[PDB]
């Protein structure tokens, strides 16, 4: 502003997402990373009826030390989640500080963590009814994803969020273009590549598609039922390129029920076009629960 001579530039105000700062009283932190946390937060008055009523959120923010391109990164974010829509197994945005102060997103708040986690401590509660659910749940968020035409470019168990009632949420579905993303949990975290969930053409092609998320689809569906297990586990990343080009894949876990056997080998073939849309592994699970009971 030539006016006053101001020391930064300001984000566009979007009345539609808006939330007043006052009404959003933050408390302990959910995560951390250097240049990124989300802290956990009471909003009130967050739908018009009912003034005056708390709801728990998680409120996303870069700390002093981030970059400019993290916030546009961050932005970038917000934008795509805006575009998205309301589902159930989506971590979805409930409002947005964009003025008078920091960036905050306020999103849907998962206490239980990560999908990995949840399931690594709970290894002697985890029977086959559960565990499906949580496959079903993870189907049903991507098969909304693929409807609204956003790409993961990143499905894993440790991007599955995981509520109290143990919903699963999937995050981080609209980062921005990039690899190198600040973490906002952990002040140390892996930074490389994601391998052994990305399909071979992402891999070596760098393409990108809903059918290379439907393969990393597979690999979660594999950590699922291994309790959280560490995909090809203690194998490099020579060796893994070398035999997945020969068409080997992960062997069948142990007490795996053979139709998720089947379902994971579909989402490894090797053509993307003979892969199952999301639509048919939302339905093949269902069949699954039925079963399981």
Known sequence: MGSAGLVSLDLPLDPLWEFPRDRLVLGKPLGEGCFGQVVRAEAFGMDPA??????????????????????????????????????????????????????????ECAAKGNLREFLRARRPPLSFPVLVSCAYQVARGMQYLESRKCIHRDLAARNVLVTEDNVMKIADFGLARGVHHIDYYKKTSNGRLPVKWMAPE?????????????????????????????????????????????????????????????????????????????????????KVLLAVS
């Open 202 to 286: 992402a891999l070596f092609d760098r393409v990108y598609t809903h059918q290379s998320d439907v393969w990393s689809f597979g690999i979660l569906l594999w950590e699922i039922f291994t309790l959280g297990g560490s995909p090809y586990p203690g194998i490099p990343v020579e060796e893994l390129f070398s035999l997945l080009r020969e068409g080997h894949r992960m062997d069948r876990p142990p007490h795996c029920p053979p139709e998720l056997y089947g379902l994971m080998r579909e989402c490894w073939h090797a053509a993307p076009s003979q892969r199952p849309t999301f639509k048919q592994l939302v339905e093949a699970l269902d």
């Open 50 to 107: 009912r003034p005056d009523q708390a709801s728990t959120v998680a409120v996303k923010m870069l700390k002093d030390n981030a970059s400019d391109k993290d916030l546009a990164d961050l932005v970038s974010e917000m934008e795509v989640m805006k575009l998205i829509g309301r589902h159930k197994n989506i971590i979805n945005l409930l409002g947005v500080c964009t003025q008078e102060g920091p960036l905050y997103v306020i999103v």
